[PDB]
């Protein structure tokens, strides 16, 4: 059989940056080929693979990361990054062996009043580690002086939410981003092209 | 800017209910809290709403007695206000929170509540 698609990319709802949702794609075929030929994506980046050649390519096993963060914050989605979404909510390692991929979701993810219910992390005691999912809710404190409560001075909600309105500037829009890490252990006999 | 005004306060008696409102003036994408100033403490934290909706925050003294919502559409939030105690008498404020720096920049005058027993 072939590797999900749709399943992945076409799918209708898409997760917040800081909750980013795992795709284990093992056990079957998958050809590129159909991801370059559409001119949707805005962004089709690859670190330690060739473009063209993926299709000829033959992995263990693959992880799709699916998630949406701003147009600006795109730029973030990278190995060696810093700021805050790269910091606080997805990080990158330096030996990253996969693929980056984004596109434009304004049309699609934009109300007229504006969407909020897509959230992100802006705090937090320690930098990620690569791959590494923190969806804790406890409020985290900034200054010296110890908040067991709740929100006040230097004792604030670590999440935030995206104004994403269709009048917003590109930078403000909003982008669904798409992760593919691969992997290789002693039995490679998984995952291969067409 | 971002403006605050609150509404829907007064005199109760012990127990009962309150629903206390905050107007906003075009303010979009900020977490939203109530602050109420007690005479012994004041200034102190009461609850908390995402703009989403969700996130929702409380004290735990007041845990399961009040229960805060928005309606981002009619631009405004309520607080609903169950079981009142004379500890919770009250100026009670509505502040908004900056999306950059959360700190509650943009504040409201406030009105009052007053438990009697």
């Known amino acids: 059989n072939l590797c999900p698609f749709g399943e992945v990319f076409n799918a209708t709802r898409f997760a917040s940056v800081y909750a980013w949702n795992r795709k284990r794609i093992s056990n079957c075929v998958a050809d590129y080929s159909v991801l370059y030929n559409s001119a949707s994506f805005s962004t089709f980046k690859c670190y330690g693979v060739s473009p063209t050649k993926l299709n000829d390519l033959c992995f263990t096993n693959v992880y799709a990361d699916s998630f949406v963060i701003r147009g600006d914050e795109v730029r973030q989605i990278a190995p060696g990054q810093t700021g805050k979404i790269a910091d606080y909510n997805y990080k990158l390692p330096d030996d990253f062996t996969g693929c980056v991929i984004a596109w434009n979701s304004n049309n699609l993810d934009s109300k007229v009043g504006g969407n909020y219910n897509y959230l992100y992390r802006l705090f937090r005691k320690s930098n990620l580690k690569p791959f590494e999912r923190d969806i804790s809710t406890e409020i985290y404190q900034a200054g010296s002086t110890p908040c067991n409560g709740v929100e006040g001075f230097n004792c604030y909600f670590p999440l935030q939410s995206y104004g994403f309105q269709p009048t917003n500037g590109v930078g403000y829009q909003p982008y669904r981003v798409v992760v593919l890490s691969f992997e290789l252990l002693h039995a490679p006999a998984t995952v291969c092209g067409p | 800017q971002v403006q605050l005004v609150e509404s829907g306060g007064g005199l109760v008696q012990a127990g009962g209910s309150l629903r206390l409102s905050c107007a906003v003036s075009?303010?979009?994408?900020?977490?939203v809290g109530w602050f109420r100033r007690a005479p012994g403490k004041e200034r102190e934290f009461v609850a908390a709403?995402?703009?989403?909706?969700?996130?929702?925050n409380y004290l735990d003294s007041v845990k399961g007695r009040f229960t805060i919502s928005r309606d981002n559409a009619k631009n405004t939030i309520y607080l609903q206000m169950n079981s009142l105690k004379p500890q919770d008498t009250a100026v009670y404020y509505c502040?908004?929170?900056?999306?950059?720096?959360?700190?509650?920049?943009?504040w409201g005058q406030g009105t009052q509540v007053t438990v009697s027993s």
């Open positions: 502040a908004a929170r900056d999306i950059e720096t959360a700190e509650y920049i943009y």
């Open positions: 075009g303010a979009g994408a900020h977490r």
């Open positions: 709403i995402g703009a989403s909706g969700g996130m929702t």
